[PDB]
Amino acid sequence: YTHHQYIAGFLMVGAFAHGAIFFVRDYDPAVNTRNGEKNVLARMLEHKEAIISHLSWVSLFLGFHTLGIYVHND
C-alpha cells in the first residue's frame, strides 16, 4: 500500500509538471483560438486567477478548520 501510494503521488506530480512544460514550450495560442474566441484549453488561462483563488480558498478553509478541530481536541 505504501509503495503504490508513493508511486501514485509521484505520477500525479509528474503529470502536472509535464502539463506546465506543455504550457511553457508546446502551447500555441493561435491554434487554440478561432477569430478571437478561445477554445476549451485556452479559456483555462482566462479564468486562471479564478481557479487559483478558489483553490487557495479551499486549501485555507480545509487547513484552518482541520487544524482547528485537531488542536481543539488536543
Partner: protein, 130 residues
Amino acid sequence: KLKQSDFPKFEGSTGGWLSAAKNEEKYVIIWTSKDASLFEMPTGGTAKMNAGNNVAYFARKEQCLALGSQLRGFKITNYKIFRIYPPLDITLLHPFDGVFPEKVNQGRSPVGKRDASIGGNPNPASLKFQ
C-alpha cells in the same frame, strides 16, 4: 620592495590573482593620481596610491571596474582597464572609444536592439527545433 615603481604601495594579499591569470587572461588597470591617497583594494585591504602613474593587475574585469568606480570618489577619471592574454596581448577594454559608456558618443551602433517591446516576442512553441 616591489617589482615596478608604479605599483600602488600594497603589502600583498592572499586574494589576488591565481594560476588562471597566468594561462588564460589577466586584467590591468592604469591611472594617474595627484595625491598618494589611501584606497581599498577590490581583493584585500588598504593600498596607497602613487602621486603619479599607478598600475594594478587583477584576475577579473569586474575587480578592475570596481577599483575604477572607487577611483571616481577620489575625482580620478582617467583610469583605463586592459585585458592581457597569456602573452603580452594588450586590449583596451573600459574606455573603449575614450568616452565612458554612460555618455553618448558618436560612432557607436546599437547592439542587441529589438524594435518592439517585450510583448512582441515570438511564442516559444514556434521556436521549436531550430
